[PDB]
RNA sequence: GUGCUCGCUUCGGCAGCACAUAUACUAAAAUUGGAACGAUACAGAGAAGAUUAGCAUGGCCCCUGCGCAAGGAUGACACGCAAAUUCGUGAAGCG
RNA sequence: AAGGUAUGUAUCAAGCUUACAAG
């Protein structure tokens, strides 16, 4: 039902050679979620590693910009539910054989004839990002997903084949902790880690800190930016620019919105391009 | 054609409402894939000196218009200061010695290119696992 | 099972008026019904999906129209 | 740079792929418009006729 | 690894030449979803009396068959929507 | 060879199917 021509693939899958040769069938599998006949690719990403063929078809990956056999965003490197969550749109797809699944795949892939370049639907909202995500982005990927699996017979100890067993050994997985939006298991870990970061203690008070020492202003952040990045949270009491140490003094009168600036500015408010200084300001008449 | 129009740049402001991925150039959802026409051999050659030593020369056509530096781990390109699989090398070192057996007269004796090497609490683990 | 017995005539329903468009697509009274079905269950993102494919048939009937209107 | 070989196909396998589904007919193309003469109605003794 | 060349000085040491990257990697699987048939118990059998030959139409139902034959109980599955006639309500317009 | 010993449901394994994506 499906040709191609050259697949999608997320870097980590390529492997860490840029001259790999890749060999590709005409109906190869069927696709994993909807058994349609793509045509599967094969590689030796590195050489110590596993194949990796193909997952999907290039329908299915063109929905949710997915790669082509990892099953992570081609944008960032990262889950599929992370990515809407993250992007709070799910673009709904059916769980049935047929109930509306693929009259949906054949419907969306009806009108995706024209393009070929982008995602369906995600191209509107992949724009208004790099906030909540680009915190885990993780770049220079590890490469023990090119791994090859392990193998049985060293769990057993049988492996006859001594040293040119290909696969692994010793390590022996844990059955504790190892599909296409809900629910995946490391993700609930992966979003627990999100959600519990190490800031900077919360200190014993009610909500005196509405001063905060931030600073590394330099030529890039002047006093109207800052103060109409706080004019959108609220009201000043009294604002500086203390431009001897590149500095900026705001507070607010009834804390609660510059709260959510020590929330925005713990070394995460990036406006302008910059990694931003921040530290603990006084609020104690010193 | 002339080189003035297509090397003329674009004015704006670059439009970073986007993310990077969206903005770069692409014909295929991932990257713009074009065909290529090298010569066999030298793209075999330097694909086996990455894939044993884990240096090659990178390929290119205008990513900074100059280019021609050595990738991956790059120290180790100068230890054996850029030289190949194809070649008989400087030294010979660390080489590993077979014993042979090349008559084809004994019995369950003779191993030719099939020689097996001179070389030749986990499970307690393993049986709470399992 | 009061959410057993619920989704039980929903889903009989459903099933009822799914085989009778799968049957007949052409009489345009299974749509207007089955759509009015669920317009009975007064939150619905579904029988807005009912009309719109309902047209796909017979987008020529005015019923149609200024029903769903 | 990648080299993109393409697979044998051994002359002994049958259809690999069950070709055998159905799913009703899609969406067809988005209607054009209709335009007819305005539209007139008889009466109520020709449509009695 | 090999074989060849004193080729450079020891048969031995060295140098050059020729040869140039296989594998749906597993004997496994912690494996995997398990539909068909057979058993179990139900339901039971087209056409306004009874027994009934059939051939069709529709598609998100299939089986046997080399089938653009044919047969699978007519292969099964196919049901109350009346409309316009009386009357209520409401709208648009006019006198 | 079909044309006759009906078919239609509800639970219970091998046959066949991938040996994969995976913090
Ligand atoms: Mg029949
Ligand atoms: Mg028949
Ligand atoms: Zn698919
Ligand atoms: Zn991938
Ligand atoms: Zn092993």
């Avoid at chain 1, 790099?130 to 023990?144: E, F, G, V």
Wanted: aromatic residues 10%; proline residues 7%.
């Amino acid at each position: 039902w499906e040709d191609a021509d050259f697949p999608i693939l997320c870097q980590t899958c390529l492997g860490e050679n840029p001259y790999i040769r890749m060999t590709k069938e005409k109906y190869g599998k069927e696709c994993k979620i909807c058994a349609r006949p793509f045509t599967v690719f094969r590689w030796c990403p590195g050489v110590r590693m596993r194949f990796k063929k193909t997952e999907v078809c290039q329908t299915c990956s063109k929905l949710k910009n997915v790669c082509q056999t990892c099953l992570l965003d081609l944008e960032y490197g990262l889950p599929i539910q992370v990515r809407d969550a993250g992007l709070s749109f799910k673009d709904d797809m059916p769980k049935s054989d047929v109930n509306k699944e693929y009259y949906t795949q054949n419907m969306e892939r009806e009108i995706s004839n024209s393009d070929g370049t982008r995602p369906v639907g995600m191209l509107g909202k992949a724009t208004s990002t790099s906030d909540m995500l680009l915190k885990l982005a993780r770049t220079t990927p590890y490469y023990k997903r090119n791994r090859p699996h392990i193998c049985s017979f060293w769990v057993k100890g049988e492996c006859k084949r001594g040293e040119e067993c290909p696969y692994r050994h010793e390590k022996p997985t844990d059955p504790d902790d190892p599909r296409y939006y809900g629910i995946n298991d490391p993700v609930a870990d992966k979003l627990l880690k999100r959600a519990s970061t190490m800031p900077r203690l919360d200190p014993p008070e009610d909500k005196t800190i509405t001063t905060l020492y931030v600073g590394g202003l330099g030529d890039t952040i002047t006093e109207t930016d800052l103060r109409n990045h706080f004019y959108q949270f609220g009201e000043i009491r009294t604002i500086t620019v203390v431009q001897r140490q590149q500095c900026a003094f705001i507070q607010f009168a009834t804390r609660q919105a510059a709260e959510v600036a020590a929330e925005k500015s713990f070394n995460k408010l990036i406006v302008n391009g910059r990694r931003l200084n921040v530290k603990w300001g006084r609020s104690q008449a010193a | 054609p002339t080189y003035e129009t297509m090397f003329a740049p674009e004015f704006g402001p670059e439009n970073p409402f986007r993310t990077q991925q969206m903005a770069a150039p692409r014909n295929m959802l991932s990257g713009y894939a074009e065909p290529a026409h090298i010569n066999d051999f030298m793209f075999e050659q330097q694909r086996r000196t990455f894939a044993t030593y884990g240096y090659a020369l990178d390929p290119s056509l205008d990513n900074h218009q100059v280019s021609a530096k050595y990738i991956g781990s790059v120290e180790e390109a100068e230890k054996n200061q850029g030289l190949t699989v194809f070649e008989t090398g400087q030294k010979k070192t660390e080489k590993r010695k077979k014993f042979k057996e090349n008559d084809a007269s004994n019995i369950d004796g003779f191993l030719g290119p099939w020689a097996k090497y001179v070389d030749e609490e986990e499970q307690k683990e393993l049986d709470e696992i399992t | 099972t009061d959410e057993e017995e619920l989704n039980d005539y929903k889903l009989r329903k459903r099933k009822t008026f799914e085989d009778n468009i799968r049957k007949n697509r052409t009489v345009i009274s299974n749509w207007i019904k089955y759509a009015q079905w669920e317009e009975s269950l007064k939150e619905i993102q579904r029988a807005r999906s009912i009309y719109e494919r309902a047209l796909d048939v017979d987008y020529r009937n005015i019923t149609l129209w200024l029903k769903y209107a | 740079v990648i080299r993109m070989v393409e697979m044998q196909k051994d002359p002994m396998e049958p259809p690999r792929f069950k070709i055998n589904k159905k799913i009703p007919r899609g969406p067809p193309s988005p209607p054009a418009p209709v335009m007819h003469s305005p539209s007139r109605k008889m009466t109520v003794k020709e449509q009695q006729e």
